[PDB]
UniProtKB/Swiss-Prot annotation:
Its EC number is 3.2.1.17. Keywords: Allergen, Antimicrobial, Bacteriolytic enzyme, Disulfide bond, Glycosidase, Hydrolase, Secreted, Signal. Monomer. The active site is at E35, D52. SMART domains: LYZ1 (SM00263). This is Lysozyme C. One of its GO terms (molecular function) is lysozyme activity. The gene is LYZ. Lysozyme C is capable of both hydrolysis and transglycosylation; it also shows a slight esterase activity. It acts rapidly on both peptide-substituted and unsubstituted peptidoglycan, and slowly on chitin oligosaccharides. It is found in: Secreted. In the egg white and polymorphonuclear leukocytes. InterPro entries: Glyco_hydro_22, Glyco_hydro_22_CS, Glyco_hydro_22_lys, Lysozyme-like_dom_sf. Gene3D superfamilies: 1.10.530.10. It comes from Gallus gallus (Chicken).
Length: 129
């Protein structure tokens, strides 16, 4: 599923992400925009044999189990395929564990580069939340 901006903001709010770990809702929307372009089925392979899965591009070496990644730790205790669902619940629950570890939201390289240091509130502005 490809979400719209405010559509996703509302879904993330419903799952308690506003100010989770101190990160305002716009941070999470911005992260999804630049990690996956709001696409719940996004997948991207990496040189280390891992793959990043879903709306928040959750990695299969540390966080989810995809059965094919050397060194898998499965710290979210979730199969990676569940992170490709149209409903964001499993991805949000794993993201809450990631942000509590991957040194806050720096675990999301696209957020680090393309969101951090900008006025991320613009990502929720004008949404009926
Ligand atoms: O249940 C839904 C569904 Br279905 C779609 C959308 C939207 C939308 C708009 C475009 Br344009 C787009 O390309 C996509 Br995908 C979705 C949308 C609609 C009105 C205002 C803002 C948005 S937006 O801020 O969410 O974009 C909102 C909800 Br709620
Ligand atoms: O399937 C949809 C689609 Br598509 C759009 C919308 C909404 C919406 C629509 C427009 Br237009 C807009 O500019 C904005 Br912002 C939000 C909406 C979202 C959350 C709360 C209230 C509305 S409400 O405004 O519809 O009451 C709800 C459903 Br369900
Ligand atoms: Cl702006």
């Amino acid at each position: 599923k490809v979400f719209g901006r405010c559509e996703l903001a509302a879904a993330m709010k419903r799952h308690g992400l506003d100010n989770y770990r101190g990160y305002s809702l716009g941070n999470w929307v911005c992260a999804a925009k630049f990690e996956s372009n709001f696409n719940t089925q996004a997948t991207n392979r990496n040189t280390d044999g891992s793959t990043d899965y879903g709306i928040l591009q959750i990695n299969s070496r540390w966080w989810c189990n995809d059965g094919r990644t050397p060194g898998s730790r499965n710290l979210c205790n979730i199969p990676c395929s569940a992170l490709l669902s149209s409903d964001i619940t499993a991805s949000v629950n794993c993201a809450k564990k990631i942000v509590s570890x991957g040194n806050g939201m720096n675990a999301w390289v696209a957020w680090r580069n393309r969101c951090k240091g900008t006025d991320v509130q613009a990502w929720i502005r004008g949404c009926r939340l």
